[PDB]
Subunit: 205 residues, 5 copies
């Protein structure tokens, strides 16, 4: 505790918070989804509700430290309010996302942060054909709300959504779930736009 | 980060926050809507729920800086709690507006601020006829709650609401969507009052 | 901006907040209602839901200033958290009041404050007969929760509720809406209590 | 305003808050209910919803002052976040209690504090038989969550719930409502626990003016 | 009061808050459940709603004192916001947990803390068969969100959930309820992960 308090103080109280990325100093955030449940489908409003947890990762030189100076501590946990977090959001949600987990992050001595909020999300999706053998496919994009691809570069580690914790007795069964980086360019607008497209194909059990 | 930290410190910690406009120093705010979804209609209460995002824009001298003094940085993103924002509100909502996006704004060296809250709104609207070929029109005004036209002047860049991201598989289709600056005048008072009237004509798919 | 910053600072950072009224220094508050919609009726719980905005007004010697000393500024807007506000509450609500407008108030150089929260309120009301020509009458009292009439004197400017902004296509039409000051005693206490009685007569369109 | 500001400052800024009661310095809290409405019943979850206001009263020496030294001020209102309050809770609720009144309290020069939150509560209750001439009875215990009877002693002034503001046109009519102090035990623990047991017997409305005759309007 | 004020001040104002455990200084948290009610089942979403209370216990050298120096005080209550708490969370909820009790803990002179939040939880569970003699089983794991078993070691005192306050007129009867410590190891990483699995078998009354 002596040594950890000393590290946290040295990292957080001796200088302001990371101000976020610029064009000259971009930052790469990695995203991944572990999909736990399709809880509910509303065919009268074309809204579907997901429960998942979303792995967010990035690396900052300012959160970097030598373990030998702090009792061989190599990583620590701290409230997410003590650090910058990227403004990643679902672009087509219909309710404010609900947070299901303590808002804490893991910081590693190399400056890696790992943040994994569990969320329930309602989003835009017509579930028509969900009750066929064939199912229905729905999509939702995730990305930064105000940073372009010149400041925040998104990335995935895999295109397969982790289904190893999907609720086996869910009401809907997953036929496929992928997570794909998209880059997009619109001649109106000098900057590129990056998102991760969460595509889920599912049907009634 | 060195430079942007300095800038943010200079802009935000060396002086108080912009106190908002007065009659001698009015401010012009520009509003525009991007309509994503008519989620739901309640014919028993005459309430309709929209999901959209609202582009707010203004310019303050106090937020201005010379890029050559801050590592050629020309703009930055920062939390909306760091800056003044206009009190723009829907005048005929029936629930508190629910915010769907992270509350961050973009600030540019010329003193421009761009703030873009994504919201779900319930508002007063009689959807009788929504199931005809002919649809129903419904209207909701937006404007400052406590500033007259002598302190905040509202403006739109175009009268066409942006429908380029309207959900194709929504449950209601949009027949037309406009956004019009209006100048009201209550028979008591001299000050002008100013709103942007969102009018949506729509029908059941 | 320079002058208004100076004013606000002078008013809000040079002394503590108004502590509220006392028996020796009572404060008069004026209340008025602008009724926008009867949204909903629930005949299984006898709960009715109103959207309105409530005009609150009072005057404080400590919020008073000479315009000549502050660039001829005669009034300003500020966040309702910077000033004392009266604890005016509905006495027969069934859910916490929901606030629908930005929490900002206008302060005038004579010390007048004006505050206009928009609210949705659910409250105790039997709507049996709403479907007749003749409608049903329901009532809700507003007043300070903890201050007697010796500290806070409530007042109306008129007994008529303002219906100039009642939603034309509401599902219920208003036959009459009055707002009446009532003085009410108890044996415990020399002190009179004041409420404003909102009485709405309405029916199904 | 000068004098009150001075008083509040003296009481609140010159020392820390009351840390709460100890076994050597217990505190007695007096509870009373005013029942406004049984709003709702859900026979598919056995949850009933009450709207009431709860009168909490207690007395601290550290909140005490001589009026003569503060412009003959004998009492004042202040935000409940400025003072200690007791952790009184419903023991069998099914949702977080919702607060319907401003969180303000009244403090008196003898150190008395009075705090009266209006609340809506959902709680465990099987309303089967609510539609009979004979009604259903439901019960909910209120007490401290973490302080035993050696630290907080609960009390009621009367065992009758106040029904003088029960909603006349409610959907359910009250046949009886009481509020009784109770002293629990358990094998583990020599230390008594104290609750106030709110018991309400009610039915589905059958006449414009309720079950019991009463003279006064 | 004098002595307890002195103690709270000494424990809480003289030094920072406990920063949380580390590999070199792990902390053992004991968990136990007292189940009050299965409130509700939703067979259309496979969500069940529990009301329970969760006993949490741990011990910290920094919260330790000698009673002889503080008027023979041996323990005290204080707001959970004054001390560190573990980030114990349900792993398969479908809504944010709702807290039904005041957030206060008991601290003992030996450094033991005891914290007992009453909660309502909606969580993933298929209730098909609940209406049989035979009932249905459901399970939800609890554990730290971001601390591994090298930092937080979870324990139970007993595997039996306390049913001595289960609602006798609940709508569902409890056939069995157990709480079991589990250790899992993932191929990614060297450190073990601990959870307490709450298993409840029930049926319709
Ligand atoms: C200056 C003005 C506006 C913004 C807001 N961003 C703009 C518009 C929304 C957000 C993120 C991005 O727009 C994304 C977005 C993201 C990827 C591909 C296309 C789009 C098209 C508009 C859109 C519509 C709904 C929801 C999200 C988006 C760029 C940011 C800076
Ligand atoms: C429904 C219809 C119109 C509105 C528009 N706002 C409402 C009314 C005008 C504007 C701003 C404000 O009205 C102001 C107003 C503005 C600031 C503070 C108080 C008031 C109420 C006094 C007043 C008196 C005469 C004319 C206007 C006003 C609230 C709001 C809801
Ligand atoms: C369903 C089953 C289990 C959980 C909770 N566990 C899962 C895995 C450990 C623990 C909390 C968290 O996972 C930790 C974990 C813990 C802290 C910070 C990051 C991570 C990253 C996911 C991960 C990957 C490999 C090994 C451990 C972890 C989610 C949540 C949902």
């Amino acid at each position: 505790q002596a040594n950890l308090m000393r590290l946290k103080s040295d990292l957080f109280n001796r200088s302001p918070m990371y101000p976020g990325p610029t064009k000259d100093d971009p930052l790469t955030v990695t995203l991944g989804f572990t999909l736990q449940d399709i809880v509910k489908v509303d065919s009268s409003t074309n809204e579907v509700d997901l429960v998942y947890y979303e792995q967010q990762r990035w690396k900052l030189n300012s959160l970097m430290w030598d373990p030998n100076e702090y009792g061989n501590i190599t990583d620590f946990r701290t409230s997410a309010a003590d650090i910058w977090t990227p403004d990643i959001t679902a672009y087509s949600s219909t309710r404010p996302v609900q947070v299901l987990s303590p808002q804490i992050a893991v910081v590693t001595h190399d400056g890696s942060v790992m943040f994994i909020p569990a969320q329930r999300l309602s989003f835009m999706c017509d579930p028509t054909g969900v009750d066929s053998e064939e199912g229905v496919t729905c999509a939702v994009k995730f990305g930064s709300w105000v940073y372009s691809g010149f400041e925040i570069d998104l990335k995935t580690d895999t295109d397969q959504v982790d289904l190893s914790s999907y609720y086996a007795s869910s009401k809907y069964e997953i036929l496929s779930a992928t997570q794909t980086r998209q880059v997009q360019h619109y001649s109106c607008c000098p900057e590129p736009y990056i998102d991760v497209n969460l595509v889920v194909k599912f049907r009634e059990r």
